[PDB]
Amino acid sequence: STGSATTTPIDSLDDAYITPVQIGTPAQTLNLDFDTGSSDLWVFSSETTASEVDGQTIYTPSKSTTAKLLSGATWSISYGDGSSSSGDVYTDTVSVGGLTVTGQAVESAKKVSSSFTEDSTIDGLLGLAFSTLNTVSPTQQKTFFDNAKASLDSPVFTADLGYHAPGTYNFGFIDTTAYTGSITYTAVSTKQGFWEWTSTGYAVGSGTFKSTSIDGIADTGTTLLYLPATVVSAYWAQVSGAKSSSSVGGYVFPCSATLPSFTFGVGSARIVIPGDYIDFGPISTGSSSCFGGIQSSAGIGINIFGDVALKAAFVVFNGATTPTLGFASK
Numbered sequence: 001s002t003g004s005a006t007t008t009p010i011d012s013l014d015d016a017y018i019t020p021v022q023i024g025t026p027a028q029t030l031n032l033d034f035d036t037g038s039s040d041l042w043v044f045s046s047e048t049t050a051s052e053v054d055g056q057t058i059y060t061p062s063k064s065t066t067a068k069l070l071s072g073a074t075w076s077i078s079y080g081d082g083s084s085s086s087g088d089v090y091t092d093t094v095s096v097g098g099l100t101v102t103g104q105a106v107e108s109a110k111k112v113s114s115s116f117t118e119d120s121t122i123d124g125l126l127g128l129a130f131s132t133l134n135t136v137s138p139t140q141q142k143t144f145f146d147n148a149k150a151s152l153d154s155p156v157f158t159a160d161l162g163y164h165a166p167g168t169y170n171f172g173f174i175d176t177t178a179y180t181g182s183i184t185y186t187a188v189s190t191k192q193g194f195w196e197w198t199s200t201g202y203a204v205g206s207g208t209f210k211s212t213s214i215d216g217i218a219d220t221g222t223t224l225l226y227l228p229a230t231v232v233s234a235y236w237a238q239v240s241g242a243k244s245s246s247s248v249g250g251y252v253f254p255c256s257a258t259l260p261s262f263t264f265g266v267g268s269a270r271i272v273i274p275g276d277y278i279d280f281g282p283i284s285t286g287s288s289s290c291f292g293g294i295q296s297s298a299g300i301g302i303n304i305f306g307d308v309a310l311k312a313a314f315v316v317f318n319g320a321t322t323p324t325l326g327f328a329s330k
Contacts, residue, residue, distance in 0.1 A: 001099055001100075001148070001151045001152055001153065001172055002098070002099060002152065002153055002170070002171055002172035002173045003095075003096045003097035003098050003099025003148075003169075003170070003171040003172065004097040004098065004168060004169075004170045004171070004175075005019050005020065005021075005096050005097030005168070005169050005170075006019070006020075006166050006167070006168055007019040007034065007161065007162075007166065007167050007168060007169050008166045009162065009164065009165070009166070010119070010121040010122065011121070012164070012281075013223075013280055013281055014161075014162075014163065014164060014223070014307060014311065015223050016033050016119075016122065016221070016223065016307075017033065017034070017161060017167070017220070017307070018031035018032065018033060018121060018122060018123075019031065019032055019033075019034050019096070019097075019126070019169055020032075021094060021095070021096055021126060022094070022095040022096075023043070023059055023064070023092055023093070023094050023106055024059065024061070024063070024064030024065075024066060024067055024092050024093060025064055025065045025066040025092075025093060026064075027095070028057075028059055028060065028063070028064065029057070030043055030044070030057050030058075030059060030123035030124055031057065031121065031122065031123045032122070032123060032124050032125060032126040033122050033124070033125045033126070033221060034125075034126045034128055034159075034169055034220055034221070035125050035126065035127050035128060035129070035219070035220055035221030036127075036128040036129055036159070036194075036195055036217075036218055036219055036220040036221065036317065037080075037129055037194060037195075037217060037219035037220070037221045037222060037304070038077065038079065038125065038127040038129055038133060038221060039127040039128075039129045039130060039131055039132070039133035039134040039135075039143050039193065040075060040077050040107050040125065040127045040133075040134055040135055040136070041094070041104065041105065041106060041107060041124070041125065041126045041127055041143065041144055042075065042077070042085055042087070042106075042107035042108070042109055042124050042125055043058070043059040043106060043107070043108060043109065043123060043124035044056040044057070044058045044059065044109055044112070044116075044123050044124055045058050045059045045060065045061070045087070045108040045109055046058055046059070046060040046061070046062065046108075047087060047088070047108050047109070047110050048087075048108075048109045048110060048111070048112060049110060049111055049112075052111065052112050052116075052117045053117065054117050054118065054120055055120030055121075056120060056122070056123045057123045058123070059106065059108065059123075059124075061090045061092065061106075061108065064092055066092050066093045066102075067090045067091070067092045067106075068090060068091050068092070069088070069089075069090055070088075070089040070090060070091055070105060070136075070139075070141075072138070073088060073089035073105075073136050073137065073138070073139060073141075074086070074087070074088055074089070074136070074137055075087060075088075075089060075107045075135045075136045075137070076135055077135045079221075080222065080300065080304075081115065082113075082115075083113045083114075083115040083116060084112075084113045085109045085111060085112040085113065085116060086109065086110060086111050087107060087108045087109040087110035087111065088107075088108055088110065089105055089106070089107050089108065089136055089141070090105075090106045090108055091103045091104060091105055091106065092104060092106050094106065094144060096126075096144065096169070096171065097169070097170075097171065099148055099151075099152075099171050099172065101144055101147045101148050103147070104144055104147055105134075105136060105141035105142070107136065107141075109124070125221070126144055127143050127144075128143060128144070128145050128157065128220070128317065129143070129193055129194050129195065130143075130146075130190050130193045130194070130195075131143050131146045132190070132193045133193035133194075145157055145171070145317075145319060146319075148171060148172075149319055151172075152171060152172035153172045153173055154172055154173055154174070155172075155318070155319045155320050156171075156172065156173070156174060156316055156317060156318050156319060156320075157169060157170060157171045157172075157317050157319070158170045158174060158175070158178075158314065158315060158316050158317065159220055159310060159314075159315045159317065160175075160178050160179075160314050160315070160330070161220065161307055161310055161311035162311065163274075163276070163277055163311050163312075167311070174316060178314050178330065179313075179314035179328035179329065179330045180328065180329050180330055181328060181329055182328065183314070183316055183326040183327065183328040184266045184267045184268070184269035184326065184327055184328070185267075185316070185318070185324045185325065185326045186198070186266050186267055186324060186325050186326075186327070187324060188318075188323040188324050188325055190323060192217075192302075194217040194218075194219070194302075195217055195218040195219075195317060195323070195325055196215065196216070196217050197215075197216070197217075197218065197325050198213050198214065198215050198216075199213070199214040199215075199216065199264050199265050199266065199305075200212075200213065200214075200265030200266065200267060200268070201213075201214070201264070201265040202214070202227075202231055202262065202263060202264050202265065203262070203263040203270075204234055204235050204238050204260055204261075204262060204263075205238055205260030205261055205262075205275075206260075207238075209263065209265070209270070210234075211265075214227065214228065214231070214264075214303055215302075215303060216297075216302065216303030216304055216305050217302060217303070217304055217305065218305050218310060218315060218317070218325055219304050219305065219306050219310075220306075220307060220310060221306075222304045222306030222307065223280075223293075223306055223307050223308070224280075224293050224294070224295050224304075224306050224307070224308050225262070225273070225278075225293060225294045225295070225304070225305060225306055225308040225309045226295050226296065226297035226300055226302075226303055226304040226306065227294065227295075227296070227297055227303050228296070228297060228298070228303065229296045229297075229298045232251065232294055232295060232296045235260070235262055235294050236251050236253065236292065236294070238260050239253045239254075239257050239259060239260070240254070240257065241253060241254040241257065242254075242257070242292070244296075245289075248283050248289070248291070250291065250292060250295045250296070251291075251292040251294070251295060251296075252283060252289045252290060252291055252292060253289070253290050253292055254288065254289070254290070255281075255282060255287070255288045255289065255290040256288070257290070258275065259275030259276065259278045259279055260275050261273060261274050261275050262275075262278065262294060264305075264309060266327040269327065271309070271312050271313045271327055271329060272312065272329070273308060273309060273312040274312070277293060277308055277311065277312060278292060278293035278294055278308065279292075279293065280292065280293050293308045294308065312329075313327045313328060313329065313330065314327070314328040314329075314330045315327055316328075
């Protein structure tokens, strides 16, 4: 089997991407944030505290003939941005782009933090990291991908995120028309439960490539590119007037600037992020200070190849017995 679903930016900045997901019988379609940095499939639901719902589409298990309470199971998750959610668990039929899993754990939110409430466009998350990170207790649950894997033509999924445009998540096949040149594969460590890999270096604009190992995670659920302070300083030093602002929470730059590209290494291959991808616009409406898309990972504890990086590539998440990651230009 295979699946193929379009993923669409939630706003004009590509802050996140939503992908329609069918849950239950008859289908209830919710728009979920596919997150390769976490491993819970959770949804706004008929159980979510009413004051914490503001425009989201909810899953109502009582209206699904295939829903079953997973008795005694609870979940609670906290994300790197400080947001959180928690609740109880149903199993139900879940389909993505024509690919169906029966008995998927669908984590129903009883509570969500303010950031989720305030984002009316995201109806929940679909985790695509390793199932060892799944938060369901006392019986840990598998991700949609883990459940689907044995049925897939090939044990892979691909992320093809657009810049200010829709893109695609495919399951079970590699669309050889969706990228240019060849795919370069690189080793993954699953020790922390993430799609963790080591980039071979970077360049700023037309500058020389610096060969240096940068361990980080491929995380579709993080907007920006978070890298070591040394690397980030080298980038922003090439932008007149750019500075790190503690009041704003990162690097800002004059909105009048033209940003240089940023290149990252994947083995001997190179992925180029155009300068425009690094512009996150005015810090507040009407400001002439713009927020940068490359930020320091210092104090996160991990480097994160978020959407800014991933959208510059066609990315293969290879979930074979020995997992790997592939990157191609597109």
